[PDB]
Amino acid sequence: GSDKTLPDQGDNDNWWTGWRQWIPAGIGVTGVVIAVIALFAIAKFVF
């Protein structure tokens, strides 16, 4: 019980922000960032 519940993103933070960010190829680094930027990319493109 340090932060989130115990792991407090210290001993096992990659579980959902490291190796899971790109286990296959394009899930978070290119998978998420691409789906997230798709929007922010327009805000800077149209504005």
Curated annotation (Swiss-Prot):
It is found in: Virion membrane; Host cell membrane. A lipid is attached at residues 41, 43 (S-palmitoyl cysteine). The chain crosses the membrane at residues 22-42. The record marks 8-9 as: Cleavage. It comes from the Viruses. The chain holds residues 632 to 676 of 676 of the full protein. It is a single-pass type I membrane protein. It comes from Zaire ebolavirus (strain Kikwit-95). Acts as a class I viral fusion protein. Under the current model, the protein has at least 3 conformational states: pre-fusion native state, pre-hairpin intermediate state, and post-fusion hairpin state. During viral and target cell membrane fusion, the coiled coil regions (heptad repeats) assume a trimer-of-hairpins structure, positioning the fusion peptide in close proximity to the C-terminal region of the ectodomain. The formation of this structure appears to drive apposition and subsequent fusion of viral and target cell membranes. Residues 43-47 are cytoplasmic. This is GP2.
